[PDB]
């Protein structure tokens, strides 16, 4: 099973927001093809 990537909080910069978003759209990609 594909890996849930963990939701960003305050505590997050742009680029962990955009890594956070690549990370969630693989998720989806992976977890489709499952």
Do not use: I, Q, S
């Amino acid at each position: 099973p594909p890996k849930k990537p963990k939701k960003p909080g305050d505590n997050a910069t742009p680029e962990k927001l955009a890594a956070y978003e690549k990370e969630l759209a693989a998720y989806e990609k992976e977890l489709a093809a499952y």
